[PDB]
Paper text:
[name] is an esterase that belongs to the α/β-hydrolase superfamily and primarily hydrolyzes cutin from plants. Unlike lipases, cutinases lack the active site-covering lid structure such that the substrate-binding cleft is exposed and directly accessible from bulk solution. In addition, the substrate-binding site is more expansive in cutinases compared to esterases, benefiting the binding of bulkier macromolecules. In this work, we investigate the PBAT hydrolysis potency of cutinases and PET-degrading enzymes, and find that cutinases outcompete other reported enzymes.
We further constructed the inactive variant S170A to obtain a complex structure of BTa but failed to obtain any dataset that contains additional electron density that can be modeled with the ligand. We thus turned to a BTa-like compound [name], which is composed of TPA and ethylene glycol linked via an ester bond. As a result, the structure of the S170A variant was determined in apo- and [name]-bound forms to 2.21 and 1.82 Å resolutions, respectively. In the [name]-bound complex, the omit map clearly indicates the location of [name] in the active site. Notably, the ethylene glycol portion of the bound [name] was located outwards and away from the catalytic center, opposing the direction of those in other [name] complexes (see below). Nevertheless, the hydroxyl group of S170 is estimated at 2.9 Å from the carbonyl carbon of [name], which is within range for nucleophilic attack. Therefore, the complex structure should present the substrate-binding mode of [name]-DM. The residues that ineract with [name], Y100, M171, W195, and I218, are conserved in IsPETase and LCC-ICCG, while I218 has an alternative residue in LCC-ICCG. Superimposing the [name]-bound complex of IsPETase and [name]-DM indicates that the ligand binding modes are similar. In both complexes, the TPA residue of [name] is bound to the TPA-interacting Trp (W195 in [name]-DM) that adopts B-type conformation via a T-stacking force.
Author numbering: 40 to 301
Write the structure that this text describes.
Amino acid sequence: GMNPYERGPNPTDALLEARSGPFSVSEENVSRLSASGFGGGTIYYPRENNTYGAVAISPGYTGTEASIAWLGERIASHGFVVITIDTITTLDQPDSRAEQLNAALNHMINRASSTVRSRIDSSRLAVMGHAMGGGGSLRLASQRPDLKAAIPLTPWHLNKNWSSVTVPTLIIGADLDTIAPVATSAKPIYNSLPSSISKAYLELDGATHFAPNIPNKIIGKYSVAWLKRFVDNDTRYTQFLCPGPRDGLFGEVEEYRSTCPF
């Protein structure tokens, strides 16, 4: 098609809500010893002979790669090369996690096997992270306006003012989070982002701080729609983001805000 970055079948709610997307995925192990500037991890990549955008995902404080593994694989299965990382130590702070997200992106582009490197369009990169890892994704986005998307999940950073970020950013909050409360963290972060960038706020209903650490159909669906729209420029996914998920009785979320139209 006209957009050279479109991958996969035309989307539906059911296809985005499924446990796995349409792309067969393989894994490349990144040992802690092979990793420069992060703690190792796993690269999930589509076996099909396309090039895809690449995504690095960081866990949060005391969290391991296993706390975010499901989301990396799910996203990769919709047509992305995704690394889920361990950090250098489990106690690393958000700004350290930002440096490690950068190191993880660089590893995929420079240090992985030719099998992985040949499937990456190194010009189309995104970052994600849970909690302090979401704070890391915000810091790195602020330093790297070349990134195509950022998805901070139940994020925390010391700094809530990310008005300098121009990367399309989807903030995911959890209404029952007591560890990084949306009242003091996710919502101040989201409202700091400029009106003039592509951004959205998605607050999960009945959700704790740890909602991102188990398979979650809503997180999977809208993370994939966000990356599709902004890493792939794929306007087939605009309809999922704008006006976006409904709230209330038959809805998907507690609250959704956006700078739609995209």
